[PDB]
Amino acid sequence: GSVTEFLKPRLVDIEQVSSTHAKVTLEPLERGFGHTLGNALRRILLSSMPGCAVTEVEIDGVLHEYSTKEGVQEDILEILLNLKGLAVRVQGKDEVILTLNKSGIGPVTAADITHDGDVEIVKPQHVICHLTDENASISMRIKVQRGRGYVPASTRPIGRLLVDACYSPVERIAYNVEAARVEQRTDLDKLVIEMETNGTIDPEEAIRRAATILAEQLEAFVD
Amino acid sequence: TEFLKPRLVDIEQVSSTHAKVTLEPLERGFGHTLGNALRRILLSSMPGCAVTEVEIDGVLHEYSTKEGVQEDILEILLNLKGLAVRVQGKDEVILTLNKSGIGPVTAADITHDGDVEIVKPQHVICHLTDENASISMRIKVQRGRGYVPASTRIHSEEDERPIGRLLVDACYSPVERIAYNVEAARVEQRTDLDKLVIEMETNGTIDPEEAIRRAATILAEQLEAFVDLRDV
Amino acid sequence: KAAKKMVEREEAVVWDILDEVIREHPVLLNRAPTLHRLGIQAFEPVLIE
Amino acid sequence: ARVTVQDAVEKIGNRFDLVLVAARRARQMQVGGKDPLVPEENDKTTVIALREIEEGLINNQILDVRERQE
Amino acid sequence: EIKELLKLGDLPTSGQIRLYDGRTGEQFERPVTVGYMYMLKLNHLVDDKM
Amino acid sequence: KPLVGTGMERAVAVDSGVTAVAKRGGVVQYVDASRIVIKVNEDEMYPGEAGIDIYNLTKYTRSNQNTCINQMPCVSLGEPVERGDVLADGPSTDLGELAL
Amino acid sequence: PANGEPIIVPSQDVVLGLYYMTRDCVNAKGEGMVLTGPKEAERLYRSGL
């Protein structure tokens, strides 16, 4: 055969575990190309994928990072931690400030956030902090911004406290290159991508976005 | 919300076989992504044109010698295995090397052909050491990919009836070593953009621009599968 | 005899048959000094070039 | 596809009545007289028989009962 | 003297350079030894045995 | 080559029969992968005969362990050679140095 | 069969990998932050942050 045609994945089968997981296996791929594709896609997903997340917060009664809130048994670090795991999506609006004025007994669920049209919470039942059967109240303002990757607080008055924003929708990428077989050839590699997301976008759509990004990057060179 | 697209900026050629590109406007990190992907593609898949077959006038196999040459036929085949040539209009061609007289038999002495071009004519194939001695061999070059060993090429025998035909191990891979570097490009109105610098050492057959274009094309085309997974 | 000749020439169809047979058919690996009973263990083969 | 037989030995004790019962069941399944119970999913008669034993639809008692019925 | 001969070129004196993983593309931590070792090929070939 | 030898590799090659060695110094007159012709220096030659030394090399003959012993020339045409110097590198030798 | 200890002990290279990977450096990159679980830890590690 000519030197232009290469083996392409003729069998690909995505298996999603019922909420947000996905085992994507695409085999057969030519020898040593599974590692290339897995590395490129994993690095794109883990480093550069547009998204939105909570960046910083401002609490009316709390000003110092290490502080105790009267009524919430969970510590401020725990509140920022739960807020870090919150999964949100935003429309064309780039920045939005939400508020969580709540008072009662039960847990301070994410569903108690003030409703908006441009903001959608994929996990309204998410827990932010617990509350006691007291007049104690929780009032805070969270800032949601649109970014590209991961930026801890160390990278970057009020005073307000910072949060390590995680804009990337993906949460775990670990590809595996398993030996495959086609006719007498058996050195062919088979790609087994494994992905989890925060729920904003299904893993297959995440892979599609990653491929679109990479291909758009490889546009001028291709002929 | 979107990344800048990289475009080649220079083809700086320190030597004929040594080249440096500069995919440049690279955005965040991709530098390493594109560098590693391109290095792996270039080292794996590139169209080479290394010698495949040799037919010497009076040699019955590749373990005897020929009177008048100070190298065994095995050493001659080893030397030819590294011959660097470029073919344009055909995927397989036959050359004709004839020489008579003491001295080295360089690849320059190969019969000239319109489409074929020997990249480094100095390349030494054998050495005649007798005035009344000569060598007359037919070289069969063909364009392939990767590295196909001689034993596995002969599977159906492709009607290899003649016994004077010697098969050398094909080495279709013009690139010898590829290394990429990432450095902060100094654009004015942007915090920090990466610039990729791919330094490659070919054997002279493939121009750097063509090689990088080929690698980018293969990576983009093969990635089309992921662009639409489409369930099963 | 035809089957023997086909296997001897190593036709391309035999590979699918072999991969069908190997699927669930343990083979006993065994080292030379089998001092104790853990020197003979049965694995499931995986065809390798 | 199967890995271990721990559930099998849990169901049938002695890890030796297991081998014999599975052998007899696989023998009936293999020679073209009988048919399987658990849905075959590309496995072989041995692993299918072990699947039947593990899931709990066959043992020595049930095997002898089905035999004496015939 | 090995250090002197290493430094006569430009290779690091300690004798360990930093290797980049071939597949991942990201650096290996803890720089690693590399050097030109002389290796034989013992005649216990596999196709004589298998 | 041994890139890190022990300085005691020339003796192993020369003293064992395989490496071959010029019996008498002189200038090479004809080098071919099968044979070598050495024109002995006039001072090293006996008065009677007009001696020229012909070394017939061995080309791909089986050794007792089925490995292939092969002697190739390591001296170009018209190059001087002295007494007891390596001419035809044997199997697993390089310019007279053992290369295993 | 001789003693009630396992015979599948990770032996000589897997063990070095785990030992190097389950350790602490008094001051390495990104010491002292808070993570939302093992997934966040792996994601941080791969990116090199």
UniProtKB/Swiss-Prot annotation, chain A:
Residues 1-223 are annotated as: Alpha N-terminal domain (alpha-NTD). (Microbial infection) ADP-ribosylated on both alpha subunits by the phage T4 protein ModA. ADP-ribosylated on only one of the alpha subunits by the phage T4 protein Alt. It catalyses: RNA(n) + a ribonucleoside 5'-triphosphate = RNA(n+1) + diphosphate. GO terms for molecular function: DNA binding; DNA-directed RNA polymerase activity; protein dimerization activity. It is an enzyme of class 2 (transferase). GO terms for cellular component: cytoplasm; cytosol; cytosolic DNA-directed RNA polymerase complex; membrane; transcription elongation factor complex. Keywords: Acetylation, ADP-ribosylation, DNA-directed RNA polymerase, Nucleotidyltransferase, Transcription, Transferase. GO terms for biological process: bacterial-type flagellum assembly; bacterial-type flagellum-dependent cell motility; cell motility; cellular response to cell envelope stress; DNA-templated transcription initiation; intracellular iron ion homeostasis; nitrate assimilation; regulation of DNA-templated transcription elongation. Its EC number is 2.7.7.6. Belongs to the RNA polymerase alpha chain family. The N-terminal domain is essential for RNAP assembly and basal transcription, whereas the C-terminal domain is involved in interaction with transcriptional regulators (such as CRP) and with upstream promoter elements. This is DNA-directed RNA polymerase subunit alpha. The lineage of its organism: Bacteria, Pseudomonadati, Pseudomonadota, Gammaproteobacteria, Enterobacterales.
From Swiss-Prot, chain D:
Coiled coil: none annotated. The keyword Transcription applies. The keyword Nucleotidyltransferase applies. It catalyses: RNA(n) + a ribonucleoside 5'-triphosphate = RNA(n+1) + diphosphate. One of its GO terms (cellular component) is transcription elongation factor complex. It is an enzyme of class 2 (transferase). Promotes RNA polymerase (RNAP) assembly. Latches the N- and C-terminal regions of the beta' subunit thereby facilitating its interaction with the beta and alpha subunits. Part of the processive rRNA transcription and antitermination complex (rrnTAC). The complex forms an RNA-chaperone ring around the RNA exit tunnel of RNAP. It supports rapid transcription and antitermination of rRNA operons, cotranscriptional rRNA folding, and annealing of distal rRNA regions to allow correct ribosome biogenesis. Belongs to the RNA polymerase subunit omega family. The RNAP catalytic core consists of 2 alpha, 1 beta, 1 beta' and 1 omega subunit. When a sigma factor is associated with the core the holoenzyme is formed, which can initiate transcription. The rRNA transcription and antitermination complex (rrnTAC) consists of RNAP, NusA, NusB, NusE (rpsJ), NusG, SubB, ribosomal protein S4, DNA and precursor rRNA; S4 is more flexible than other subunits. This is DNA-directed RNA polymerase subunit omega.
Curated annotation (Swiss-Prot), chain F:
Acetylated on several lysine residues in the presence of glucose. Belongs to the RNA polymerase beta chain family. Coiled coil: none annotated. DNA-dependent RNA polymerase (RNAP) catalyzes the transcription of DNA into RNA using the four ribonucleoside triphosphates as substrates. Resistance to the antibiotics salinamide A, salinamide B, rifampicin, streptolydigin, CBR703, myxopyronin, and lipiarmycin can result from mutations in this protein. Co-administration of salinamide and rifampicin or salinamide and myxopyronin suppresses the emergence of resistance to both antibiotics. The gene is rpoB. The chain holds residues 697 to 796 of 1342 of the full protein. This is DNA-directed RNA polymerase subunit beta. It comes from the Bacteria. The RNAP catalytic core consists of 2 alpha, 1 beta, 1 beta' and 1 omega subunit. When a sigma factor is associated with the core the holoenzyme is formed, which can initiate transcription. The rRNA transcription and antitermination complex (rrnTAC) consists of RNAP, NusA, NusB, NusE (rpsJ), NusG, SubB, ribosomal protein S4, DNA and precursor rRNA; S4 is more flexible than other subunits. In pull-down experiments interacts with CedA.
UniProtKB/Swiss-Prot annotation, chain G:
Transmembrane segments: none annotated. Disulfide bonds: none annotated. The RNAP catalytic core consists of 2 alpha, 1 beta, 1 beta' and 1 omega subunit. When a sigma factor is associated with the core the holoenzyme is formed, which can initiate transcription. Belongs to the RNA polymerase beta' chain family. DNA-dependent RNA polymerase catalyzes the transcription of DNA into RNA using the four ribonucleoside triphosphates as substrates. This is DNA-directed RNA polymerase subunit beta'. It comes from Escherichia coli O139:H28 (strain E24377A / ETEC). The lineage of its organism: Bacteria, Pseudomonadati, Pseudomonadota, Gammaproteobacteria, Enterobacterales. The chain holds residues 493 to 541 of 1407 of the full protein.
